């Protein structure tokens, strides 16, 4: 049974609700982004209308085989009427194709559902500037002040400099980057660009990247692993055993691996600067964990919410324990008292 924070009152609509069977009264199912916790349930057998971005629609069709007749892609930044209700999709600054959804209810209430997002000041100059929001359904993944991490641009600067230095000292080093979902593509794309290489990967991952509308993608990626000195591997293989096993397969072309594991936040963020990050090393293999986040920091979240001034906030993450829910409610009340709304 579908929880309350996935229903949109006063409409026939749900958000990210595909794992509960047929939801009573749902005439349109919105999908914010192609991450498995959110799409859990969709397949070729789905026969209700799905509303989403163009990129999410390409993934639904090619990766999950949803039939074309049930896929309803909408452009971004454009007022659209769905089942007699005005909606807008906005870029969420999460993974490719990820959106926030603004719903203009028949009674006059305006609701914003963030999906998963990484808040940014550029959002203060979208179509959100123009009017009031009564209800915010908020991605609270990192809603506590201990969650700190750098900008994505600082993290990419560290990875490019680290890779370029290593392969210039040793032309026979291979670079490996872990993946398990869409998102964070700038990590392997930026590194391959500085090294003058295409990125090598499996047929399955190539297919997924081909759905993403990335400009000049055919110039950037390949399934021919031998021609490439940046390889992608599933995240589970990013360990000393998995990497040794991979280097054997490369036919004595390489004598060293440098690997990157993009993570979310980790508690080494509470002491160390990005500059001071060091790898784990065994022999000719070194592994860097780098804190490249596609969710808001505490400070980014607080700025967004204090600017938007919603009348009510409904969290969508960390909602399963009394202590988590209580902690989030405390911060929402500080923010409101500090800013005066």
- In the complex, the residues that contact Ni ion under the rule CB under 5 A are 35, 116
| Least gap, CB of 23 to Ni ion (angstroms) | 21
| Least gap, CB of 35 to Ni ion (angstroms) | 4
Rank residues 31 and 66 by Cβ distance to Ni ion and give the closer one.
31
| Least gap, CB of 183 to Ni ion (angstroms) | 7
Radius of gyration of the chain (CA): 22
Chain centre distance of CA 167: 29
Q: Which residues have a Cβ under 8 Å from the Cβ of 261 and sit 6 or more positions away?
A: 178, 235, 238, 287, 288, 289, 290
Structure tokens at 149: 């991490």
Query: Which of these, 176, 187, 334, lies nearest to 250 by C-alpha position?
Result: 176
Query: Which of these, 5, 97, 15, lies nearest to 50 by C-alpha position?
Result: 15
Rank residues 183 and 242 by Cβ distance to Ni ion and give the closer one.
183
| Least gap, CB of 95 to Ni ion (angstroms) | 6
- The Cβ of residue 285 has, within 10 Å, a number of other Cβ atoms equal to 21
Evaluate whether 213 touches 60 at the Cβ level (below 8 Å): no
Rank residues 29 and 254 by Cβ distance to Ni ion and give the closer one.
29
Rank residues 234 and 279 by Cβ distance to Ni ion and give the closer one.
234
Rank residues 49 and 264 by Cβ distance to Ni ion and give the closer one.
264
| Least gap, CB of 10 to Ni ion (angstroms) | 26
Rank residues 87 and 294 by Cβ distance to Ni ion and give the closer one.
294
Task: Point out residues after which the chain has a gap (C–N over 2.5 Å).
Answer: none
| Least gap, CB of 94 to Ni ion (angstroms) | 6
Query: Which of these, 222, 208, 152, 147, lies nearest to 184 by C-alpha position?
Result: 152
* Cα distance between residue 77 and residue 91, in whole Å: 8
């Amino acid at each position: 049974t579908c929880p309350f924070y996935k229903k949109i009152p006063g409409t026939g609509f749900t958000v990210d609700a595909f794992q509960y069977g047929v939801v009573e009264g749902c005439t349109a199912y919105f999908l914010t982004h192609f991450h498995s916790d959110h799409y859990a349930g969709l397949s070729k057998h789905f026969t209700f209308p799905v509303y989403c971005s163009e990129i999410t629609g390409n993934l639904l069709k090619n990766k999950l085989h949803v039939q074309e007749q049930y896929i309803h892609p909408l452009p971004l930044d454009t007022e659209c009427i769905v089942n007699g209700v005005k909606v807008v999709l906005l870029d969420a600054n999460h993974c490719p194709g990820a959106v926030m959804i603004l719903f203009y209810l028949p009674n006059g209430t305006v609701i914003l559902h963030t999906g998963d997002f990484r808040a940014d000041p550029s959002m203060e100059r979208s179509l959100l500037a123009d009017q009031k929001v009564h209800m915010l359904y908020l991605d609270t993944t990192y809603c506590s002040p201990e969650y700190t991490f750098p900008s994505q641009q600082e993290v990419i600067r560290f990875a490019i400099n680290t890779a370029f230095e290593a392969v210039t000292l040793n032309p026979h080093a291979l670079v490996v980057c872990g993946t398990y979902s869409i998102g964070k593509e700038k990590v392997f794309l930026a590194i391959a660009d500085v090294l003058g290489s295409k990125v090598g990967m499996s047929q399955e991952k190539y297919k997924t990247l081909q759905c993403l509308n990335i400009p000049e993608i055919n110039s950037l990626i390949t399934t021919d692993m031998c021609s490439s000195l940046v390889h992608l591997l599933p995240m589970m293989q990013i360990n000393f055993k998995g990497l040794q096993s991979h280097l054997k397969k490369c036919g004595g072309k390489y004598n060293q691996i440098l690997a990157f594991r993009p993570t979310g936040w980790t508690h080494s963020n509470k002491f160390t600067r990005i500059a001071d990050v060091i790898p784990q090393t065994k022999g000719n293999i070194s592994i860097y964990g780098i804190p490249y986040s596609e969710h808001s920091s505490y400070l980014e979240m607080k700025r967004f919410v204090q600017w938007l001034k919603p009348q009510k906030i409904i969290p969508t993450v960390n909602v399963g324990t009394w202590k988590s829910r209580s902690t989030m409610e405390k911060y929402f009340r500080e923010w409101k008292l500090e800013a005066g709304y």
